Amino acid sequence: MFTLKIVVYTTVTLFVSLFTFGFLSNDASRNPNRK
Amino acid sequence: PQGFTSPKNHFASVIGLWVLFALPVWSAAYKQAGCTTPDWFGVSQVAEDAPGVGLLAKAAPEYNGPSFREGLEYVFSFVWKPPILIAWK
Amino acid sequence: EALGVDDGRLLVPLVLIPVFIAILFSNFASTQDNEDFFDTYDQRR
Amino acid sequence: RPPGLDGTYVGDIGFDPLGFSSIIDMRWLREAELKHGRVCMLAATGMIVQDVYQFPGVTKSFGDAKMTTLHDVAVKQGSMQQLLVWLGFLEIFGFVAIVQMLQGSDRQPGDFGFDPLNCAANPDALARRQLVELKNGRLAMIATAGMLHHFFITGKGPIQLIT
Amino acid sequence: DRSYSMPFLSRPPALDGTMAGDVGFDPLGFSNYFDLKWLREAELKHGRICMLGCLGFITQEKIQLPLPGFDNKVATEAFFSVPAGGLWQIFFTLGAIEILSNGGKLAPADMFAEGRAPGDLGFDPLNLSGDDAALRRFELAELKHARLAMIGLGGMLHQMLITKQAPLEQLANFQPIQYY
Amino acid sequence: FSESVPFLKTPTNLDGSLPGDVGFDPLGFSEVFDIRVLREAELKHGRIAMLATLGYLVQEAYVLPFFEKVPPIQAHDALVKSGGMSQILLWTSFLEIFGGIALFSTIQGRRYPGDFSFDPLGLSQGKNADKLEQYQLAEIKHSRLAMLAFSGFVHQGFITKQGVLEQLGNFRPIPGFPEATFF
Ligand code: CLA
Ligand code: CLA
Numbered sequence: 111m112f113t114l115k116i117v118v119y120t121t122v123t124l125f126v127s128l129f130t131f132g133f134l135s136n137d138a139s140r141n142p143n144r145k
Numbered sequence: 146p147q148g149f150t151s152p153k154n155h156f157a158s159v160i161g162l163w164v165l166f167a168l169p170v171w172s173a174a175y176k177q178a179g180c181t182t183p184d185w186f187g188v189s190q191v192a193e194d195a196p197g198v199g200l201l202a203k204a205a206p207e208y209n210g211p212s213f214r215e216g217l218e219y220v221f222s223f224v225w226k227p228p229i230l231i232a233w234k
Numbered sequence: 235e236a237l238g239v240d241d242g243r244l245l246v247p248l249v250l251i252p253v254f255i256a257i258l259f260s261n262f263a264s265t266q267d268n269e270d271f272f273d274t275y276d277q278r279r
Numbered sequence: 280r281p282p283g284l285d286g287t288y289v290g291d292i293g294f295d296p297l298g299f300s301s302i303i304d305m306r307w308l309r310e311a312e313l314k315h316g317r318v319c320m321l322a323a324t325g326m327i328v329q330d331v332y333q334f335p336g337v338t339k340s341f342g343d344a345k346m347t348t349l350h351d352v353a354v355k356q357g358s359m360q361q362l363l364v365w366l367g368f369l370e371i372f373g374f375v376a377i378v379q380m381l382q383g384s385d386r387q388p389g390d391f392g393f394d395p396l397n398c399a400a401n402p403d404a405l406a407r408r409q410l411v412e413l414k415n416g417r418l419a420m421i422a423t424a425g426m427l428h429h430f431f432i433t434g435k436g437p438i439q440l441i442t
Numbered sequence: 443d444r445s446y447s448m449p450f451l452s453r454p455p456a457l458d459g460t461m462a463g464d465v466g467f468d469p470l471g472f473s474n475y476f477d478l479k480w481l482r483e484a485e486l487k488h489g490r491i492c493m494l495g496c497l498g499f500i501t502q503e504k505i506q507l508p509l510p511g512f513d514n515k516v517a518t519e520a521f522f523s524v525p526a527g528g529l530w531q532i533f534f535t536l537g538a539i540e541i542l543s544n545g546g547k548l549a550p551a552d553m554f555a556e557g558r559a560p561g562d563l564g565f566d567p568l569n570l571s572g573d574d575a576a577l578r579r580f581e582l583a584e585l586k587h588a589r590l591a592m593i594g595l596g597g598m599l600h601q602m603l604i605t606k607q608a609p610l611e612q613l614a615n616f617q618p619i620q621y622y
Numbered sequence: 623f624s625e626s627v628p629f630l631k632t633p634t635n636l637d638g639s640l641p642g643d644v645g646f647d648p649l650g651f652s653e654v655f656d657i658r659v660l661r662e663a664e665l666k667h668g669r670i671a672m673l674a675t676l677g678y679l680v681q682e683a684y685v686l687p688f689f690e691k692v693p694p695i696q697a698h699d700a701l702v703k704s705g706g707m708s709q710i711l712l713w714t715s716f717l718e719i720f721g722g723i724a725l726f727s728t729i730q731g732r733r734y735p736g737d738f739s740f741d742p743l744g745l746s747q748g749k750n751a752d753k754l755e756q757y758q759l760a761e762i763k764h765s766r767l768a769m770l771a772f773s774g775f776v777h778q779g780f781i782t783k784q785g786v787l788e789q790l791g792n793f794r795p796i797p798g799f800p801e802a803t804f805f
């Protein structure tokens with residue numbers, strides 16, 4: 111059961127980190143009115 | 146005695162104040178005299194023409210070459226496409 | 235306890251993965267102009 | 280003649296089959312040679328004497344003891360620690376002297392200024408004594424190595440082979 | 443023309459005599475496909491970490507801190523005996539040191555954008571780099587010690603994994619591998 | 623060459639300007655850091671060492687009627703939990719804040735290193751200025767001597783479990799060593 115837990119923790123941490131650092135990458139500038 | 150009244154914490158506070166004051170006092174002393182002496186320089190017993198001694202210190206080649214991804218692909222081609230069998234042509 | 239971390243090895247994904255992505259994010263962050271802009275949002279990207 | 284081996288150093292006969300002087304500074308090499316020679320003179324003299332006198336109280340402390348066994352007992356006693364720390368204190372200033380010599384100064388390899396008897400007043404006498412010191416030191420290196428390996432094979436001191 | 447390290451392989455195109463520690467040893471064309479500054483920085487970082495690691499391998503056998511859980515002769519087992527919170531504190535401190543030293547330039551595209559030289563993090567309390575020849579010889583000595591420490595740390599760590607004995611402790615009572 | 627060390631050179635910025643300059647600086651401490659800051663540190667260390675040596679001697683010889691008679695290390699341990707060491711630390715730190723202010727004044731030239739103009743008695747202040755340099759020399763010498771002497775004291779107290787006056791009166795060897803028998 112520990113291997114499943116470590117796999118789930120790895121996957122969740124990866125996706126949450128991707129979300130967090132993606133919304134930190136100047137997301138407001140990604141609009142069609144940006145010049 | 147516990148916390149801010151413990152003598153051990155008083156000793157630790159004195160040590161921490163010493164550490165905090167170390168940077169200004171000794172940094173200023175270094176700024177006044179910072180090994181800026183004509184006799185002050187390192188010495189090595191090895192000859193300067195020994196193999197492995199660079200011509201110039203702290204070399205920074207420009208490297209107008211392949212990108213990092215091409216290098217990684219080359220390292221992978223080490224294991225999926227080595228030059229072993231092209232000799233027998 | 236803590237973040238559901240009953241085994242120390244569970245701390246390896248919880249730190250190395252956020253750091254590694256951050257390193258990638260660093261390559262983004264160093265590229266951007268990090269000066270003040272005085273606007274609602276920064277259009278420099 | 281080997282490259283990098285000029286005649287300005289005493290005891291030179293152009294003996295260098297391996298180009299150590301071509302890759303390492305000759306000042307460092309001569310300082311190391313003189314230090315090894317002096318240490319070996321003292322070591323050979325001590326290894327000879329320790330088979331005869333053994334001092335007043337060392338006999339009941341170390342038992343009999345000899346050479347490598349004497350080192351093994353003495354490191355456990357504490358004499359070796361004292362000798363190591365005091366000779367390391369001296370060798371700190373020896374390191375300073377070597378650094379100053381390599382940086383450029385009037386100092387020469389092996390010149391520690393230890394001439395209490397003023398035996399260096401005559402220049403030619405000092406010139407002869409430099410070669411004397413070098414050759415006796417090289418002989419002392421060879422002799423100390425011989426005594427050490429003879430003790431390894433038989434477990435006897437330098438005098439137990441003679442007597 | 444020739445490498446002088448492997449005299450049958452010719453000198454690598456990117457390995458000139460400018461860089462320190464260069465004897466022409468690059469049989470696999472890493473310098474042709476990777477930046478030499480990045481390679482030298484990685485080599486120096488690995489080697490400095492290995493120098494500190496070998497010194498720690500000797501010292502932890504010789505001397506231990508009186509804190510509980512810090513009294514393991516075997517360094518590999520000492521990693522797991524020490525509380526994990528302290529190890530994570532060390533990891534975060536080293537990460538902060540790396541970020542501060544590189545100034546946010548952690549990628550090969552930007553690490554040397556301002557120059558900064560490969561492996562030159564500005565750590566020089568004693569001005570031993572004033573002389574150019576002395577600096578070059580010190581760089582060669584640092585590279586040689588770095589490579590030697592990498593190999594020695596690998597050997598000591600694998601032998602510790604096999605014998606469960608500290609290196610100096612393992613040197614006495616050698617007990618060849620089939621005994622375990 | 624250096625006066626103190628015949629086989630070494632005079633350590634550059636080391637001359638008769640500061641008292642007790644025999645040219646003894648084999649490691650370039652006076653070149654890594656300012657010589658006046660180092661002199662201030664040396665004077666602080668030496669004065670504290672002189673006070674510590676006198677205190678060690680008197681505490682071994684005599685004790686006040688309101689303090690437990692214990693060895694000086696045991697005195698430190700006992701008064702750490704009693705609060706007296708806290709009082710000493712507090713007042714010494716209060717004085718040393720102004721001491722650090724004076725040291726920062728020393729760094730930007732101005733005042734002499736280790737000089738606080740402290741002179742309750744008329745010794746080398748007026749009518750005796752011609753002896754002042756002499757006094758300075760004596761001071762640092764005592765300082766250096768104390769910086770060794772106290773050290774020996776405590777470490778001798780660590781190895782023989784005896785006071786320095788006890789070791790002088792009964793100079794027995796290191797414990798367990800007269801029996802010897804290491805082989
Ligand atoms: C918060 C933590 C943190 C952060 C942000 C950084 C940041 C950085 N580190 Mg790291 N570092 C840290 C903590 C940290 N460090 C600690 C605690 C240590 C241990 C003391 C290290 C040890 C370390 C080394 C040794 C190196 C770095 C490097 C770097 C830089 C490049 C990062 C990168 O691209 O790697 C992203 C991660 C990877 C690319 C994965 C690692 C690659 C694997 C391990 C290689 C495996 C090779 C394989 C075993 C050999 C083949 C065998 C054969 C038989 C096939 C960057 C500035 C590198 C650098 O400066 O390069 C120039 C470098 O060489 N660091
Ligand atoms: C001048 C301010 C002052 C004051 C108010 C105090 C107050 C105190 N100190 Mg002292 N102390 C001071 C300065 C001061 N300290 C300085 C400058 C040092 C040297 C660094 C020390 C060193 C010191 C030690 C080593 C110890 C104390 C201890 C104590 C506490 C116990 C009081 C006591 O013994 O019973 C009442 C006091 C007596 C019965 C003694 C007679 C006092 C007479 C009657 C009063 C004379 C006037 C008085 C000294 C006020 C001076 C200032 C005034 C003229 C304006 C008390 C809180 C002790 C402690 O921590 O408690 C366990 C302790 O061991 N102090």
Ligand code: KC2
Nearest residue numbers: 509511512524525526527528529530531532533534535536
């Ligand atoms: C050089 C890297 C490093 C830095 C820069 C650093 C800074 C700080 C700071 C900031 C100034 C604070 C406030 C702080 C506090 C504590 N550190 Mg420390 N610390 C570092 C390294 C280690 C190691 C290796 C260990 C350790 C410990 C503790 C404990 C004990 C917890 C407890 O009482 O059980 C506490 C309270 C031990 C540990 O956490 O064990 C569970 C232990 O092994 N630390 N630490």
Ligand code: KC2
Nearest residue numbers: 334335336337338339340341353356358799800801802803
């Ligand atoms: C400066 C010359 C000198 C040196 C360099 C030297 C070196 C060593 C070493 C070094 C490795 C050890 C280990 C050692 C040991 C002992 N010495 Mg000795 N010692 C020297 C001189 C004297 C004198 C004058 C006496 C003496 C004594 C003892 C006793 C006593 C108890 C015992 O006999 O059990 C022991 C254990 C006294 C005595 O009783 O001698 C029978 C005594 O009067 N020693 N001694």
Ligand SMILES: CC1=C(C#C/C(C)=C/C=C/C(C)=C/C=C/C=C(C)/C=C/C=C(\C)C#CC2=C(C)C[C@@H](O)CC2(C)C)C(C)(C)C[C@H](O)C1
Nearest residue numbers: 493494496497565566567568569587590591594597598609
């Ligand atoms: C830069 C900088 C400065 C500095 C500095 C510093 C901090 C210098 C520190 C340097 C250090 C610690 C270098 C350590 C190297 C360790 C090595 C090479 C270990 C090798 C092990 C081997 C070969 C092995 C092995 C083993 C094997 C494998 C298995 C066993 O069976 C046998 C054995 C035990 C033999 C300072 C402040 C001075 C000044 C300056 O202004 C800037």
Ligand SMILES: CC1=CCCC(C)(C)[C@H]1/C=C/C(C)=C/C=C/C(C)=C/C=C/C=C(C)/C=C/C=C(C)/C=C/C1=C(C)CCCC1(C)C
Nearest residue numbers: 492517518519520521522592593594595596597599600603
């Ligand atoms: C398990 C464990 C323990 C504690 C917990 C932990 C930290 C999580 C973990 C550690 C993990 C770690 C840190 C593991 C680290 C493991 C390491 C450092 C492995 C390195 C091995 C080095 C090798 C094989 C180099 C060999 C050199 C050679 C062959 C030289 C050849 C030569 C060349 C080319 C030049 C010509 C001459 C010759 C001599 C021929």
